[PDB]
């Protein structure tokens, strides 16, 4: 692995802010500002994917994620014709289990300081409208974030964004959800990422946790600034993000690649431990 | 040393088109896109200098650069109060001599491909209007670039920049030229960096090569979006770069730091070899 060499200046402030506000929290000894990315993905950081390495959003294409082995371009980014963009990102979670992933995705979302463990440089804020769900009885791990919305403030590039991420049952997009078990997929986190104000789509997002001998691998896909949720129409009266005068789908896709690899490789360093300490 | 983990999308295009066009030059074998920064400056990539670590442009301040040992914050960046920026950077050149540096600063400037050697991802073009100066007999190395103007197209961040660098004798800014020999300074590359059209000031630029026992060390200073050339009056009719909407002096200073460290650490990997091969 190799240490990150670029830290946008607003994020140099935020990481210090986060380090301080978390001082007394019990999980605070998980706060490590050190971030890195594995040697194996460096080619993906230096050149875009070719068009034929891009996965589509039809159920045919999506369900290709359930095949054993790997697809073309497991990790990379590129611009798309619309002015939209695409990111794929594989991240390994050795010595962790998909249940830890499931656990993690609701656990982090109720305290901002918890969120800042995940990316100490970029995560500023997170809240839900349903605090109750943290403690309610007889819910599985999935039931505590699937269906929910996370209102998030974070940096995915130079500037802070206010985004709303709603998680969905993958079957809603035509995923062969029943086939998840046999394909060794044991956790998922899929949904739409909208801008807080205009509700423009920043990303259709997929996270699939597939079991490996050492733990599990995360296979993630983002279709950036696309026109619609898969298997749905565009929302009437909401413009595509590609219409925003300065916006670049290609560059956003690159930032998403860098962000995703930084975020999830970091999580993978302390997920099995924070689970053992704060989970069931 | 650590490899660069961040490559703006336009530079990923430029490095490929740079590799293509150099293919068949006699110095093509020096083209290597692997870039890296030393462990010792990571601190400086993660947080800004405080203002008491910023050197001024008064001849009294500039001349501190001649003092034995180091100043505070030899390597770093920060915003300045008036929207301006500041970059300082130290880069080590083991097995190199200041004379190779004097040689390099003219030799590279006469073909765009030579320039691309220096930073394969960011250098797109260079031209000078005095091609005879390359082959005029009996000129010192310094006479081949001091007073000359290099018209440059390059990335210092996300977007190409068309700039013009005009190199000056350091005396012209109040530098105790007499003192250079005894301070171990055997080469210099100082000048004003102006924007192609507007002639707005992008940087006041100082590069000093001080002899070390392993070769030389390069000590660099940039005052970004400053108001005038040292020891001179602001040109009437030119706005300060800080007046352009969107310009962050602070952000530009950070880009300049990443850019200096990449560039000159890269130059250091091959300068002794290409001097031996293409110099005197
Ligand atoms: Mg995120
Ligand atoms: Mg340069």
């Amino acid at each position: 692995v190799h240490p990150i060499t670029y830290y946008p200046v607003d994020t140099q402030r935020l990481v210090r802010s986060n380090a301080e506000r978390i001082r007394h929290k019990p999980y605070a000894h998980y706060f490590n500002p050190d971030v890195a990315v594995p040697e194996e993905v460096f080619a993906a950081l230096k050149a875009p994917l070719e068009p034929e390495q891009v996965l589509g959003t039809s159920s045919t294409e999506l369900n290709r994620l359930l095949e054993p082995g790997y697809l073309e371009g497991e990790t990379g980014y590129c611009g798309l014709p619309d002015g939209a963009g695409y990111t794929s990102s594989l991240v390994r979670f050795p010595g962790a289990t998909p249940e830890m992933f499931r656990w993690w995705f609701w656990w982090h979302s109720f305290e901002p300081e918890r969120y800042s463990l995940w990316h100490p440089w970029c995560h500023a804020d997170i809240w839900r409208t349903d605090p109750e769900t943290e403690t309610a009885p007889n819910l599985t791990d999935e039931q505590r974030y699937v269906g929910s919305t996370h209102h998030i403030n974070e940096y995915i590039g130079q500037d802070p964004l206010d985004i709303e991420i709603t998680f969905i049952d993958p079957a809603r997009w035509g995923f062969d959800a029943d086939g998840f078990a046999a394909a060794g997929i044991g956790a998922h986190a899929c949904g739409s990422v909208l801008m807080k104000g205009s509700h423009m789509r920043l990303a259709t997002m997929v996270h699939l946790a597939r079991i490996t001998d050492d733990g599990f691998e995360l296979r993630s896909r983002y279709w950036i600034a696309d026109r619609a949720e898969p298997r749905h129409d565009p929302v009437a009266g909401i413009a595509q993000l590609t219409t925003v005068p300065g916006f670049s789908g290609e560059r956003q896709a690159y930032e998403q690649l860098v962000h995703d690899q930084t975020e999830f490789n970091h999580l993978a360093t302390f997920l099995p431990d924070i689970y053992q300490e704060f989970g069931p």
Side-chain angles (χ1 to χ4, degrees), chain A:
Chain A
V1 314
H2 304 298
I4 297 291
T5 55
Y6 185 78
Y7 302 84
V9 301
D10 282 17
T11 76
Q12 289 170 33
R13 293 168 194 116
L14 182 52
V15 71
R16 287 187 267 288
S17 184
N18 285 351
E20 141 184 345
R21 81 163 172 192
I22 204 183
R23 47 194 29 177
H24 296 161
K25 308 284 173 182
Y27 37 78
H29 76 278
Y30 285 114
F31 192 91
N32 186 359
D34 291 356
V35 290
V37 290
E39 167 63 32
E40 59 171 337
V41 314
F42 269 59
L45 294 178
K46 295 169 178 182
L49 297 161
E50 296 300 320
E52 71 276 4
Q53 298 178 291
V54 170
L55 188 81
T57 51
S58 61
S59 62
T60 298
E61 278 279 277
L62 287 177
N63 282 310
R64 277 171 60 53
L65 286 171
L66 284 73
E67 309 178 354
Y70 299 110
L71 309 164
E72 247 168 292
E74 283 286 334
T75 298
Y77 86 103
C78 62
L80 296 176
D82 321 353
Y86 169 85
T87 306
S88 65
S89 182
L90 185 133
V91 184
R92 309 191 184 273
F93 284 76
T97 54
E99 61 178 339
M100 307 181 180
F101 193 78
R102 292 204 292 275
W103 164 78
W104 171 260
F105 260 87
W106 67 266
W107 190 83
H108 84 267
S109 62
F110 303 105
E111 299 200 276
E113 299 83 26
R114 298 188 204 190
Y115 188 45
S116 71
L117 293 177
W118 196 353
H119 200 326
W121 302 83
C122 296
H123 293 165
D125 192 28
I126 192 172
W127 55 273
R128 294 162 66 145
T129 59
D130 59 313
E132 325 99 18
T133 313
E134 189 182 353
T135 58
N138 301 306
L139 307 177
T140 60
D141 283 319
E142 293 197 4
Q143 295 182 292
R144 296 185 197 268
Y145 64 99
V146 180
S148 61
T149 307
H150 302 359
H151 306 254
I152 292 171
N153 176 277
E154 73 172 337
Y155 283 87
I156 314 179
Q158 290 289 326
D159 293 329
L161 310 163
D162 291 289
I163 63 181
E164 314 176 331
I165 301 174
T166 298
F167 300 80
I168 41 83
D169 182 335
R172 161 191 188 75
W173 291 351
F175 269 108
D176 184 7
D178 284 344
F180 277 6
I185 291 157
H188 57 72
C190 301
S192 303
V193 186
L194 314 188
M195 305 290 89
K196 171 181 175 70
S198 51
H199 297 304
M200 293 179 153
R201 294 184 72 74
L202 175 59
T204 293
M205 153 186 94
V206 163
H207 293 300
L208 305 183
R210 181 163 74 167
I211 286 135
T212 65
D213 300 328
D214 305 283
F216 74 90
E217 58 197 17
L218 194 56
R219 305 168 77 202
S220 306
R221 299 292 192 280
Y222 315 70
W223 297 264
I224 299 196
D226 54 7
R227 225 187 306 257
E229 190 191 4
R231 196 164 283 250
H232 292 83
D233 285 331
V235 172
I238 302 305
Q240 187 168 354
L241 191 61
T242 57
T243 67
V244 175
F247 178 79
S248 165
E250 199 198 2
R251 293 181 176 182
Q252 191 56 38
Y254 190 64
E255 300 295 338
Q256 190 57 62
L257 175 62
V258 166
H259 185 96
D260 177 287
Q261 283 281 324
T262 300
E263 234 168 23
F264 289 103
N265 282 282
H266 196 49
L267 185 60
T269 59
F270 69 94
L271 171 70
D273 281 352
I274 199 172
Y275 172 76
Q276 167 110 65
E277 179 173 340
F278 285 84

